[PDB]
Scaffold this active site. Structure first.
Site, PDB file in Angstrom:
ATOM      1  N   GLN D  11       0.815  -1.215   0.000  1.00 30.60           N
ATOM      2  CA  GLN D  11       0.000   0.000   0.000  1.00 30.60           C
ATOM      3  C   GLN D  11       0.852   1.271   0.000  1.00 30.60           C
ATOM      4  OE1 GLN D  11      -3.543   0.456   2.520  1.00 30.60           O
ATOM      5  NE2 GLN D  11      -2.630   2.342   3.304  1.00 30.60           N
ATOM      6  N   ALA D  12       1.806   1.387   0.937  1.00 31.06           N
ATOM      7  CA  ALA D  12       2.604   2.612   1.005  1.00 31.06           C
ATOM      8  C   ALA D  12       3.372   2.831  -0.287  1.00 31.06           C
ATOM      9  CB  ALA D  12       3.578   2.594   2.188  1.00 31.06           C
ATOM     10  N   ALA D  99      -0.538  -9.766   3.345  1.00 28.74           N
ATOM     11  CA  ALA D  99       0.365 -10.349   4.321  1.00 28.74           C
ATOM     12  C   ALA D  99      -0.038 -10.063   5.763  1.00 28.74           C
ATOM     13  CB  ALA D  99       1.787  -9.852   4.062  1.00 28.74           C
ATOM     14  N   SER D 140       6.948   0.424   2.428  1.00 31.36           N
ATOM     15  CA  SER D 140       7.011   0.655   3.871  1.00 31.36           C
ATOM     16  C   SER D 140       7.930  -0.361   4.544  1.00 31.36           C
ATOM     17  CB  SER D 140       5.622   0.581   4.518  1.00 31.36           C
ATOM     18  OG  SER D 140       4.992  -0.683   4.300  1.00 31.36           O
ATOM     19  N   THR D 145       3.620  -6.771   3.353  1.00 30.84           N
ATOM     20  CA  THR D 145       4.101  -6.848   1.980  1.00 30.84           C
ATOM     21  C   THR D 145       5.320  -5.964   1.771  1.00 30.84           C
ATOM     22  OG1 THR D 145       1.887  -7.305   1.198  1.00 30.84           O
ATOM     23  CG2 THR D 145       3.504  -6.551  -0.452  1.00 30.84           C
ATOM     24  N   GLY D 146       5.205  -4.680   2.143  1.00 37.94           N
ATOM     25  CA  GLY D 146       6.327  -3.765   2.026  1.00 37.94           C
ATOM     26  C   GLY D 146       7.596  -4.279   2.675  1.00 37.94           C
ATOM     27  N   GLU D 254      26.228   6.924  -9.192  1.00 35.13           N
ATOM     28  CA  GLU D 254      26.731   8.152  -8.580  1.00 35.13           C
ATOM     29  C   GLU D 254      26.166   8.380  -7.179  1.00 35.13           C
ATOM     30  OE1 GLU D 254      26.615  11.226 -11.666  1.00 35.13           O
ATOM     31  OE2 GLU D 254      27.512  12.658 -10.240  1.00 35.13           O
TER      32      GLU D 254
END
Ligand SMILES: Nc1nc2c(ncn2[C@@H]2O[C@H](COP(=O)(O)OP(=O)(O)OP(=O)(O)O)[C@@H](O)[C@H]2O)c(=O)[nH]1
Ligand SMILES: Nc1ncnc2c1ncn2[C@@H]1O[C@H](COP(=O)(O)OP(=O)(O)CP(=O)(O)O)[C@@H](O)[C@H]1O
Ligand SMILES: Nc1cc(C(F)(F)F)c(-c2cc(N3CCOCC3)nc(N3CCCC3)n2)cn1
Ligand SMILES: Nc1nc2c(ncn2[C@@H]2O[C@H](COP(=O)(O)OP(=O)(O)O)[C@@H](O)[C@H]2O)c(=O)[nH]1
Ligand SMILES: [Ca+2]
Ligand SMILES: [Ca+2]
Ligand SMILES: [Ca+2]
Ligand SMILES: [Ca+2]
Ligand SMILES: [Mg+2]
Ligand SMILES: [Mg+2]
Ligand SMILES: [Mg+2]
Lengths: 54, 344, 423, 438
Positions: D11-12, D99, D140, D145-146, D254
């Site tokens: 989501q995030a 999750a 997140s 999930t994140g 870089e």
């Protein structure tokens, strides 16, 4: 305090100002961990189902 | 109401502060590790400043300034004074000092000592360390070679500072003393000097011959234990001022306190950009103990700054109450004994 | 993410029916299953609890179970009786005689395969089944004995789905038979092992609220059930409405259950009023944390909160809500365990319940709940030590050992709560 | 020209990616239907914006982005929102159930079943690249999930694209902004597994963004939309060098070269100024000196912490708008004499400066006022370890009672992974201490 590496284009410019000088895991190894976790889930579910059959 | 935690069980000052807060009916003490506090009375060492100011909806205040150790460790005080342009190498109220490891100033110390031995000037220095806690690990010697061997036996950083050969001696007694001033810096970085200081006196006559005997030379209260001239080798300002008027035709304010105020202001203004908690997500205040010496020309010299000072017994009540009024209730109000040192 | 609802026995079906009246009203569904609402927020997550029949009709995903026909005839005659899918009424004729063993082992065993056939037919048409919720009492025979048998057969067929219950705990103050402590203790043993979340609704607390607070001299089951249906609407608000935070049953269990056996929650609701007066946010927050507003007859100041969920309904100042929630924690700083950081969660939903401009629902996982299990265990032992009323159960093939084991497990649960109350 | 593939996870990550690609389209003159009237090369090119956008024969300019989430509701908003025409359907990947805020569920249980599909979709974007630089990964720390799926994805990207750079934009958990109770667990587990695989990670603490939004935008109760538009301005200023003509931070390599002298310590602190309320009818425009000074105010950092009590290893200033080098050096001169800016002894005291003349673009009707000049400072300071200590302490409080651990073991994770991850973070905190303290 010196300015160095001044680059200019029509969009903007970049440069550096110096104030003072100074004084992997393989594919098989990942799938092993994934399958080891899956078999542990499978073991716990079979223990549950065995407990329920009792 | 308001909440606070206590993490230095060994603080005489903040035990009394805690006692006062509780007895207002508007403060509740929580367990040491409850993060939902308004006020932290923190530990002396390794205080977790990084965990302060992240509690949603709590205004959080702590009784130490992160970074103030720069002033309150003898080694870093010397480095701060030398390398701060606002204090400069040209600072006139701090005795000549060098930091010596067993960066390091071993060679430049001997260079000034040589000028003194060649010059036949008074060449007596004192070596100490903040790691020498309470009357331990101090050597006064007229020979530079002997001072360094003392430092190498211990395995910690020391400072070598010019011993003040010509101190102001109280009479009767021909006796040394030092001055402790308590200074409260609040969350707005107002600097408040407590009206009352104490002279810690030596009970035995000053003897410039042998520095082997460290009793008439070390003014520390623990080292004096005595008491025949004043109760507990402590003289308060009303008496010392009356002494200066009777014996020297001057006042405490004129001959000494103007200098003390200048030195406090200079030190604390110097580190203000590095430690101020204006515009920080948590706020600090701190109580400081400044230690001064006075020489026979009525010149005042800074010896050290203490970051976690105790207080004189008959002053705990007044000063601790002042900490509540000025440092705590100014941030957490409920339902002057200080002199404000104005600055910038 | 569909939820399958099951209601078993007299208590389970009467409280279940009221639940469906309340949330049908909140979602704009009339007694014929037609939607007549005025806000798309009503239909956005309606599939969690309703199937869509042809002709734009909404049908509760609800299964009605009993071992005698009486209470389910009443439901079919009731106000919203016609919304339920007729195939989803599964009942016997024998009864279970307030006897856990009849519900769990003899009469219930004859009926349970039919119930699982309907459960399976509802699960098969789920795009992604979240899990199951069961309403039932623990003091009778069908809801208690057949209800927990059902939970065990559902877990075996769907071991990876969440199982939730709203379980009504018996009280001598509102009692039908003396065997209720036996039935409840046998049931708690089941629930400890086979549910992820149990909302403990104590008929003692419900009675006290009606008597002391609502000023009802003589509460009826109808009066107690008004409190239950309102609480059930509150706790399921974050599943039923497009509130942010993205909460399904599993996310709820993950955030509320730090140890698998300690999943018994104290619910609460505010306001409870004996009215048209505006209820301010400070009042909602104070009341929802007051013991007098909680539906398990346990004093929360006698223990410590592991986790808390707080759901505010209406249009109100979010800033004032955050403010008051942070305030109530400081007045109760002792009563939250310090070793679960940020263990109080605040949720808001714009849709208020019927007839209230705002309300608040409290869900606490408190170690004080051990008081409820201690009460039951005391009442169990007073009879069991003299083997009183046991023949009703040994006559159904049960042995005394099974009573001893269930008592042991409940006393283990109690001491578990006490252990974390002192951590 | 060298391509960059963006990947948004959970989501995030998805909602922030929406805010970023919306802003990119505004910055490059790309309409929501993908057309770009100023791109006179139809159906192809190797301009600077082509690093982020490919081109169809129809002139559609298509983000090089994959969106991944384990339940469909957030990505369904993408499919139906303003920019639906931008993305190919294959780019938007959703599973069935999420999750549940459980790292082990995102990483092991559900990760195992969707990772090949995600890689296949990423490979298809890569096959369209003549010289792929690597990946920008948005997620997140706290989500199941994140945290869990991203760490699996990062491992497989190292296998499949070993020579490619990988940057992170990571949302660090704050209780003000809706959180799960187990987010400290998820944050540590994902940082441990991802550490070796990230070349440079930009942490954004939701507490700081929340507070900038309350204090500078006068928003009483910020939404995710408020937070994400502010975050997307900071992301845009970090990536503007990849999408515009320039000579500083022109490829992903870089970023390591300029900001990361020690691989493990790869978390630069971002500071941004000015943030000015659009509703503020009266606004006085801030100077180069003032916006540069604001870069040393903790109140403008993406992670609240105190740089005065850390040490710098590197420091980049990225300006947008009406700025010339003369003003930058005059501002830096004043600030060095007024502020506590200590570098480690083995690094040069100095600043790499980049100026892009186009002022910040803001979303029409949004909360940010259009300003004549802004700056993003990227500094690698040891003070950011304060954020690790805070997180590690919350982990310790819970893990000492094994609170919530059974949820993770139940998904097939061993309890040992917890202490393994925690010991890695303890080593990370020790590295920061060794670099930064006297
Ligand atoms: N800044 C910001 N933070 C967000 C946003 N969405 C969620 N969060 C934060 O992310 C964390 C929750 O993780 P999510 O990204 O929502 O979870 P997820 O990756 O979808 O994983 P699941 O557990 O499967 O739902 C919390 O700390 C939230 O505050 C967003 O749009 N912007
Ligand atoms: N340069 C100097 N000249 C003369 N006397 C000195 C001196 N430096 C220190 N002293 C004496 O030695 C005593 C102890 O010094 P110092 O204060 O540095 O040690 P300390 O930290 O252990 C005790 P405190 O905390 O009270 O200051 C002082 O009271 C002072 O009388
Ligand atoms: N019936 C309910 C309702 C909610 C509600 F409304 F979402 F808050 C919750 C709940 C959800 C949650 N989350 C967290 C992450 O987002 C998903 C919802 N975190 C929490 N808490 C309680 C302890 C600390 C966290 N509790 C649980 N049961
Ligand atoms: N709150 C409430 N409790 C009930 C209701 N009906 C029965 N009870 C309680 O539930 C228990 C009796 O179980 P019951 O549901 O009637 O038996 P069952 O039909 O065999 O499941 C006793 O504790 C009663 O006090 C009801 O409608 N509401
Ligand atoms: Ca029969
Ligand atoms: Ca069958
Ligand atoms: Ca082109
Ligand atoms: Ca790599
Ligand atoms: Mg001292
Ligand atoms: Mg009955
Ligand atoms: Mg999600």
């Amino acid at each position: 305090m010196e300015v160095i590496e001044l680059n200019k284009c029509t969009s903007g410019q970049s440069f550096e100002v110096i104030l003072k000088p100074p004084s992997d895991p393989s594919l098989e190894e990942i799938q092993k961990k994934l399958e080891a976790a899956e078999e542990r889930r499978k073991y716990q579910e079979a223990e549950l189902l065995k407990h329920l059959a009792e | 109401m308001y909440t606070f935690v206590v993490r230095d069980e060994n603080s005489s000052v903040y035990a009394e502060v805690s006692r006062l807060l509780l007895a207002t009916g508007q403060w509740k003490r929580l367990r040491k590790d409850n993060p939902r506090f308004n006020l932290m009375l923190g530990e002396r060492n390794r205080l977790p400043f990084g965990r302060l100011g992240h509690e949603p909806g709590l205004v959080q205040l702590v009784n130490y300034y992160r970074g103030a150790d720069k002033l309150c460790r003898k080694a870093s005080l010397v480095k701060l004074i030398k390398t701060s342009p606002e204090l400069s190498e040209s600072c006139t109220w701090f005795p000549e000092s060098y930091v010596i490891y067993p960066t390091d100033e071993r060679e430049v110390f001997l260079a000034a000592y040589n000028r003194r031995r060649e010059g036949r000037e008074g060449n007596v220095w004192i070596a100490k360390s903040s790691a020498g806690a309470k009357g331990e690990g101090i050597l006064i010697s007229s020979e530079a070679s002997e001072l360094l061997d003392f430092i190498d036996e211990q395995g910690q950083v020391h400072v070598i500072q010019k011993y003040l050969e010509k101190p102001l001696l109280l009479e009767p007694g021909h006796r040394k003393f030092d001055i402790r001033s308590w200074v409260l810096v609040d969350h707005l970085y107002n600097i408040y000097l407590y009206r009352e200081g104490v002279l810690r006196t030596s009970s035995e006559p000053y003897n410039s011959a042998n520095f082997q005997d460290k009793t008439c030379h070390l003014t520390n209260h623990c080292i004096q234990k005595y008491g025949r001239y004043e109760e507990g080798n402590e003289m308060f300002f009303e008496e010392f001022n009356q002494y200066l008027m009777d014996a020297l035709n001057t006042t405490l304010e004129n001959s000494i306190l103007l200098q003390i105020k200048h030195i406090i202001r200079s030190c604390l203004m110097c580190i203000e950009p590095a430690i101020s908690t204006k515009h920080l997500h948590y706020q600090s205040f701190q109580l400081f103990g400044f230690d001064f010496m006075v020489d026979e020309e009525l010149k005042v010299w800074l010896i050290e700054v203490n970051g976690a000072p105790a207080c004189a017994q008959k002053l705990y009540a007044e000063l601790c109450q002042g900490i509540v009024d000025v440092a705590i209730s100014s941030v957490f109000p409920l339902a002057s004994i200080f002199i404000k040192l104005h600055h910038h | 993410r569909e939820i399958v609802h099951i209601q078993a026995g007299q208590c389970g079906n009467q409280i279940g029916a009221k639940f469906w009246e309340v949330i049908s009203d909140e979602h704009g569904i009339d007694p014929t299953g037609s939607y007549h609402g005025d806000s798309d927020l009503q239909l956005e997550r309606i599939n969690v609890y309703y199937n869509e029949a042809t002709g734009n009709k909404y049908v509760p995903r609800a299964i009605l179970v009993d071992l005698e026909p009486g209470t389910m005839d009443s439901v079919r005659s009731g106000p919203f009786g016609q919304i339920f899918r007729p195939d989803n009424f599964v009942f016997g004729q024998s009864g279970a005689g307030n006897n856990w063993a009849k519900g769990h082992y003899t009469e219930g065993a004859e009926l349970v395969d039919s119930v699982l056939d309907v459960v399976r037919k509802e699960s098969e048409s789920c795009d992604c089944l979240q899990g199951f919720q069961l309403t039932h009492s623990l003091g009778g025979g069908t809801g208690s004995g057949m209800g927990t048998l059902l939970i065990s057969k559902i877990r075996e067929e769907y071991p990876d789905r969440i199982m939730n219950t709203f379980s009504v705990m018996p009280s001598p103050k509102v009692s039908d038979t003396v065997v209720e402590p036996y039935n409840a203790t046998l049931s708690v043993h089941q629930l400890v092992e086979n549910t992820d979340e149990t909302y403990c609704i104590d008929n003692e607390a419900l009675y006290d609220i009606c008597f002391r607070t609502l000023k009802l001299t003589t509460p009826t089951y109808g009066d107690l059930n008004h409190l239950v249906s309102a609480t059930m609407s509150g706790v399921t608000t974050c599943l039923r409405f497009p509130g942010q935070l993205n909460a399904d049953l599993r996310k709820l269990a993950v955030n509320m259950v730090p140890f698998p056996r300690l999943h018994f929650f104290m619910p609460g609701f505010a306001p409870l009023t004996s009215q048209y007066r505006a209820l301010t946010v400070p009042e909602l927050t104070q009341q929802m944390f007051d013991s007098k507003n909680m539906m398990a007859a346990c004093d929360p100041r006698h223990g410590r909160y592991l986790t808390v969920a707080a759901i505010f309904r209406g249009r109100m100042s979010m800033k004032e809500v955050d403010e008051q929630m942070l305030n109530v924690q400081n007045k109760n700083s002792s009563y939250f365990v310090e070793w679960i950081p940020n263990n109080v969660k605040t949720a808001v939903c714009d849709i208020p319940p019927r007839g209230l401009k705002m309300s608040a629902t409290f869900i606490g996982n408190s170690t004080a709940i051990q008081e409820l299990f201690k009460r039951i265990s005391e009442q169990f032992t007073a009879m069991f030590r003299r083997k009183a009323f046991l023949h009703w159960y040994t006559g159904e093939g049960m042995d005394e050992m099974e009573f001893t084991e269930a008592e042991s497990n409940m006393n283990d649960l109690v001491s578990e709560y006490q252990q974390y109350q002192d951590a | 020209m060298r391509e960059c593939i963006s990947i948004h996870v959970g989501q995030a990550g998805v909602q922030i990616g929406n805010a970023c690609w919306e802003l990119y389209c505004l910055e490059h003159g790309i309409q929501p239907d993908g057309q770009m009237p100023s791109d006179k090369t139809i159906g192809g090119g190797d301009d600077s914006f082509n690093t982020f956008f490919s081109e169809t024969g129809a002139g559609k300019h298509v983000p090089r982005a994959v969106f991944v989430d384990l339940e469909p509701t957030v990505i369904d908003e993408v499919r139906t929102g303003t920019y639906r025409q931008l993305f190919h359907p294959e780019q938007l990947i959703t599973g069935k159930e999420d999750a549940a805020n459980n790292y082990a569920r995102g990483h092991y249980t559900i990760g195992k079943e969707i990772i090949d599909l995600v890689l296949d979709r990423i490979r298809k974007l890569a096959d369209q690249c003549t010289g792929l630089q690597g990946f920008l990964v948005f997620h997140s720390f706290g989500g199941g999930t994140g945290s869990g799926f991203t760490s699996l994805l990062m491992e497989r990207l190292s296998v499949d694209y070993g020579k490619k750079s990988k940057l992170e934009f990571s949302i660090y958990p704050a209780p003000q902004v809706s959180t799960a109770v187990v987010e400290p667990y998820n944050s540590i587990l994902t940082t441990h597994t991802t550490l070796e695989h990230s070349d440079c990670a930009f942490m954004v603490d939701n507490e700081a963004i929340y507070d900038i939004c309350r204090r500078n935008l006068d928003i009483e109760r910020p939404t995710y939309t408020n937070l994400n538009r502010l975050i997307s301005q900071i992301v845009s200023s970090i990536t503007a060098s990849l999408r515009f003509d320039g000579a500083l931070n022109v490829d992903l390599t870089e970023f390591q070269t300029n900001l990361v002298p020690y691989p493990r310590i790869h978390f630069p602190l971002a500071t941004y100024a000015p943030v000015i309320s659009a509703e503020k009818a009266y606004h006085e425009q801030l100077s180069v000196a003032e916006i540069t000074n604001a870069c040393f105010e903790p109140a403008n950092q993406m992670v609240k912490c105190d740089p005065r009590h850390g040490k710098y290893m590197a420091c980049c200033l990225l300006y947008r708008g009406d700025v010339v080098p003369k003003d930058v050096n005059a501002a830096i001169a004043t600030i060095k004499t007024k502020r506590s800016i200590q570098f480690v002894d083995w690094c040069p005291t100095g600043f790499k400066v980049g100026i892009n003349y186009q002022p910040p673009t803001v979303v029409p009707g949004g909360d940010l006022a259009k300003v004549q000049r802004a700056v993003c400072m990227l500094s690698n300071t040891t003070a950011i370890a304060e954020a690790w200590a805070r997180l590690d302490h919350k982990f310790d409080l819970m893990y000492a009672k094994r609170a919530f651990v059974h949820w993770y073991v139940g998904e097939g994770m061993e309890e040992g992974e917890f202490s393994e991850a925690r010991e890695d973070m303890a080593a990370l905190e020790k590295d920061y201490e060794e670099v930064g303290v006297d």
